[PDB]
Symmetry: D2
């Protein structure tokens, strides 16, 4: 039977060597850190946070495989397979489905000015070919046309608009809404999201769980205080270059967090003192 | 000199006061009093926010704005909080309106960010400082970065902010950086998210017709009945969505006509409520008992 | 030829000098208006647009500026009165006034601040026209919408200010007999070859001579020389933008012995920290 | 070669599985040069549906286009990609085929810093040793990029004529090729050394006259051809530019195939309007 997809997920980070090749041992450690240290429900694999759009197809497969290998059978797995290359997307979708990922997701085709019908049929084509459940990333009338499909089970919701989130939550009580803005987890929780996916949950998963639980449980003031504490972290990490900095924090716990893939630059050492201070203040 | 002025706290829910006009764009004073009183008595709101965007303030001449301030003041009792929006691209006008509202006893002034031209931050800062300087009243600014907010809030008479930016990350940063300043959110459709974000209150045009629900959202959310708070936000957003699609100011005033209020017309160039919307409006009023 | 083209030419968007209390300095205003015509050699004045700090003024001040500008120039000089306002009663009042004064046309900024519908924008123009019976220049809305506005016999043209040369070309093709005056001084040469009938600019108060050469040279196919003057004009425009356009333009005018006064607050005065850079600009281009 | 002149942003025909049609592609390449009379081909740009391709299809496009045209034809290889290893692999491959210059889109999607954008360009240059054409960014930053002797110019696509004028006089010895077909005459009088465009695949003769006549001071006749060209560009845009431009080529007996999904094919509800355009302008 299919797992329940509600929960909190680490948007999985990927460690690279000097030549932009995946470091499999570090990747394994990052996946395990998300589940075993940060106590999260699931991995969201090959999203933006994993520098996925910097990868070739064979690299994306290697990440899908290492992540699955790293976690137990009860860990929820969502495979972001979106690409401007629909043939690649279908091939990654099939491969991830065959590995047993619980659901696929796919970024809105981007760069070019695709029409809505082009966007809709890119999702439907991926579904036809893979037969896996799908999570999308649009007017309400358009969401409806997408959500009308039984295999589009939900949306990874990342646009910062709470009026549109509310309208969608209302219109589609039967669909999974997983929010993607860590810095607004508490507002997303009270807006009825079914969970969230975040890159900072790799280092701040415990506080994230409390915000989500406390807010649902009606303890708003304490959830909001933890949102304050979390946003210090998020703001700091953002100002230092978010991917390298998150991986520098993980490096600090003994994980082989490697480098970002160029053209991303590595963590700038002039930020080291400010980062050490953050780690100490929030015991990261 | 010797009079004991009631120094009101400015927390709570405020109607952004709507204004009824005749065919020549003149203020219908008697409809205004009705609208002001609906807000306080029927809608059970804490205060009136006067001569904001909602009151078609930027369509008015200086005399009409003074007129609006006087009539809203007349129409309510001494327990009602009053904030006077006095912002204008004409700073002399803003100072004039600021003095006149303060003399009437308005509890605070507010002023929109100077607009149209690309003013620098130094110019926006000094607009606010010049109005405060000439009126000596407390001032609520509009939303500018956190560092600039810090310079602004370092003025003792800038007591708070009418926050309309749809950004809950910046709202949270502001709430944390300035725990002792007043924050009133201006997005009716996100009142529940503002509340759990620690706003002190809210100003809205739809509170003229949905203030009872608005209060329930505000209270239930703070009491941690968040599920019930949100369900009332769903309902409210049904309303707000509908009225936005028909033209917010005329439609809101058409909802007040139905209560027997003399809601008149919007000022041109605003067009009247289009009768082609009449049947959907009637249906919305019916389902939500407005 | 069409009578819609009567108002072709090059216009100073008239600057206004104020005292410390935001009051109009009438004599310096006269000097600015005369400088535009006599020194800069322009065809006309565009009076009470944004450049004149119009939206900072009360109704009486806008009338004052309309009156003095008109008094300062001869009957040969072309006059356009920007009367647009969020207050349509004010707009109509200013319109009648400017018309009775003998202004050749009215113009009006697109209703702003609120999200007005197109139908609301259109009837704002239509109400001004009906109440004033003057010719009207609109501001830049799709071509289908332009087609609707330009069907009014009293809407003679557009003061075109969108940075978009595809839309302009489309407009110029679709309305060969309407007036098009461009409002971007830094793209005058591009507007010219795109068939504009003229231009309205704040920088022509200090650089109207180069501007006329750009316009004439480019219409004459002397594109290289015309472009070289745009390079010149763009050093000037870019420099002045970096220092605060209205106070800086007025400072250049003070350098010529004109009583240029101050910007109206909340605009701040020329910041002395730009003094050396400005002087360097004035000497380089002989301004 | 001197890089001045007019280039077709090369279109690519696909079959229903999104595989390159090599014969139609050779035909498209040759139409640009022989029929449209252009100086060169801009290869694997956005117009070629490049960003929908895998690495092997991109190589395939570079090879076919180069083998399709004479030695005297100017060739620029767009190799930009979010995958820098891929960009560098493509840059080496296109360089070894003999492309006269590389170009690379600005790294996109993620909020890259300027330092990241800069060194992406410099890393590609370092590894390929070919000349590079950047995409467009402040003047102080252009200066940092153009300080590099191998960064020989910019494909300028943002229709801001203030910034373009600023760049032209700041960098009078660098190459500037504009990317907006609908504003070619404004670009020409602003001193561009040439242009790259998708619509030049069907309308390259008018475009040459616009370029030439405008520089000859025959400004009104240049502008008239721009009116005519903008009727075409407008129409083509309203129907879906790439499938429509390819449909125009198909009218000429070329095997113009299909767009790669998720682009959809030409919608036949547009056929009559397209027929009338082709008749009106002899396309
Ligand atoms: Cl992600
Ligand atoms: Cl308001
Ligand atoms: Cl102006
Ligand atoms: Cl291209």
């Amino acid at each position: 039977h299919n797992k329940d997809l509600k929960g909190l997920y680490a948007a999985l980070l990927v460690p690279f060597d000097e030549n932009g090749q995946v470091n499999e041992q570090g990747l394994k450690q990052i996946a395990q850190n998300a589940i075993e240290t940060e106590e999260l429900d699931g991995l969201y694999v090959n999203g933006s946070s994993g520098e996925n759009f910097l990868l070739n197809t064979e690299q994306k497969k290697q990440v899908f495989k290492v992540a699955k290998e790293a976690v137990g059978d009860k860990v929820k797995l969502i495979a972001q397979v979106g690409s401007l290359d629909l043939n690649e997307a279908i091939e990654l979708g099939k491969y991830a489905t065959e590995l047993g990922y619980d659901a696929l997701s796919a970024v809105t085709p981007f760069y070019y000015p695709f029409t809505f019908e082009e966007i809709r049929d890119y999702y439907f084509d991926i579904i036809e070919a893979t037969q896996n459940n799908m999570i999308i990333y649009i007017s309400i009338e358009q969401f409806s046309e997408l959500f009308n499909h039984e295999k589009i089970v939900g949306v990874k919701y990342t646009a910062p608009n709470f009026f549109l989130l509310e309208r969608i939550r209302k219109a589609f009580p039967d669909k999974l809404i997983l929010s993607g803005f860590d810095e607004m987890l508490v507002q997303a929780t009270i807006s009825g999201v079914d969970g969230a996916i975040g890159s900072t949950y790799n280092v701040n998963g415990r506080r994230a769980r409390k915000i989500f639980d406390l807010a649902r449980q009606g303890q708003i003031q304490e959830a909001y205080q933890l949102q304050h504490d979390s946003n210090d972290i998020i703001e700091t990490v953002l100002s230092m270059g978010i991917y390298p900095t998150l991986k520098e924090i993980l490096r600090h716990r003994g994980i082989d967090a490697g480098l970002p893939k160029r053209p991303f630059k590595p963590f700038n050492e002039a930020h080291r003192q400010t980062l050490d201070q953050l780690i100490a203040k929030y015991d990261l």
